[PDB]
């Protein structure tokens, strides 16, 4: 009769507001402003940087990437407790009438 | 379980061990998706821009 | 001569704006609006009801 959902997975999503931020070798990780939301999915990794990138020291820098994670299709996992649910059962006697 | 226009009857421990970005069933204003890293990927082919 | 900061740490902090949220047994997990922000610190645990 009355279920209550416990966990909503999602199926199809999209990523908007995509942005990235990098920082020079050996002087720390980058810091992006919208890493603070838990909407934006984050990933730190290391790019190669040097004078052509405009930093110096010729090493492997750090980089971060964020994009806002919205949703389009969900599923709902509804659950019940073994009360408040009924079974409908039919009891037809014999000695059949027409059709 | 209840997808777009169908529905099934799945095991509970199977349903909780299911890798997709989820959200609690009481979470109104569903912005904080939790394991979002199972529906994104991060392309760093060379050692350049990802 | 010219330094550049690597990592700032936090010697001393204060906590304000405590909001809690607790839900029924065998019905999922709690969920609160300020868990989306990452200034707030969070922990899930088990009360009996």
């Amino acid at each position: 009769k009355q279920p209550a959902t416990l966990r909503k997975y999602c199926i199809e999503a999209k990523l908007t507001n995509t942005t990235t931020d990098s920082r020079c070798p050996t002087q720390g990780e980058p810091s992006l402003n919208e890493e603070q939301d838990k909407r934006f999915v984050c990933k730190h990794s290391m790019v190669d940087r040097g004078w052509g990138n405009g930093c110096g020291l010729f090493g492997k820098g750090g980089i971060v990437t964020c994009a806002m994670f919205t949703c389009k299709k969900n599923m709902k996992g509804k659950v019940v407790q073994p009360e408040n649910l009924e079974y409908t059962i039919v009891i037809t006697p014999h000695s059949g009438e027409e059709h | 379980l209840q997808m777009e226009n169908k529905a099934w009857l799945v095991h509970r421990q199977w349903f909780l061990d299911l890798p997709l970005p989820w959200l609690p069933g009481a979470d109104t204003q569903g912005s904080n998706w939790i394991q979002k890293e199972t529906l994104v990927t991060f392309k760093n082919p060379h050692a350049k821009k990802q | 001569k010219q330094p550049a900061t690597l990592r700032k740490y936090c010697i001393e902090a204060k906590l304000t704006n405590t909001t809690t949220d607790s839900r029924c047994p065998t019905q999922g997990e709690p969920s609160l609006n300020e868990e989306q922000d990452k200034r707030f610190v969070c922990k899930h645990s088990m009360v009996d009801r």
Epitope: A4 | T28 | T19
Partner: antibody
């Protein structure tokens, strides 16, 4: 035999701070919380209150958490509202409300009964 | 984020009518906290029902109610003339706060 009397403010212009008082009598004041609700004439009941104890904690409403503050004194057995920054739409009757704190002093979960015993209702206006 | 009980309701004396109110899974949908308050207009509001279906001492057994998930009800069996006051619902969220419904003023004729 439980009586909770109040005191009425006459007329407060917009901008001035207003405070009301309830004199909780008939029970141990330090082991019961003190809630505050309001009612404009012909409208709903919305919940202004906080969660008193012998501790003196608070839990304000989300609508105007940055508007109200408290004080109390168990030696006088009275709980005090403090509504500053009065506005034009804030003409309402302010009711008193009690419920019981836990046996451990704190107010974590409310009792199943909320407001068995009530107050009078304090009317404010604007001009 | 208030509850959704209707504007008003009518009943002849002797009837058994109902007053409904809906909400969300934090207000009514999980918790057994729903209360009702009768409020005569020159009077402080007086509570009619405890947690879902219980009842204070002094309140007659005419008043009853139930819950159906997100929706709670109040059935007055045997309407008399002294039920001419609006009934405000109540709840307690998972968040920690308190909400009340809109109010159903009940006429008896």
């Amino acid at each position: 035999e439980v009586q909770l009397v109040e005191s009425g403010a006459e007329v407060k212009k917009p901008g001035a701070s207003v405070k009301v008082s309830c004199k909780a009598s008939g029970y141990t004041f330090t082991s019961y919380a003190m809630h505050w609700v309001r009612q404009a004439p012909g409208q709903r009941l919305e919940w202004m209150g906080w969660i008193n104890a012998g501790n003196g904690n608070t839990k304000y409403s989300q609508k105007f958490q940055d508007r109200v503050t408290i004080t109390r004194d168990t030696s006088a057995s009275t709980a005090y509202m403090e509504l500053s920054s009065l506005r034009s739409e804030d003409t309402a009757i302010y009711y008193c409300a009690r419920d019981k704190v836990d046996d451990y002093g704190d107010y974590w979960f409310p009792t199943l009964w909320y407001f068995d015993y009530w107050g009078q209702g304090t009317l404010v206006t604007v001009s | 984020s208030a509850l959704t009980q209707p504007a008003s309701v009518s009943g002849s004396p002797g009837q058994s009518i109902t007053i409904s109110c809906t909400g969300t899974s934090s207000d009514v949908g999980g918790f057994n906290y729903v209360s009702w308050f009768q409020q005569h207009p020159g009077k402080a509001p007086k509570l009619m029902l405890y947690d879902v279906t219980s009842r204070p001492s002094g309140v007659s057994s005419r008043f009853s109610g139930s819950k159906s998930g997100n929706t709670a009800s109040l059935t007055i069996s045997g309407l008399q003339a002294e039920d001419e006051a609006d009934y405000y619902c109540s709840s307690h969220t998972s968040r920690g706060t308190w909400v009340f419904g809109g109010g159903t003023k009940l006429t008896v004729l």
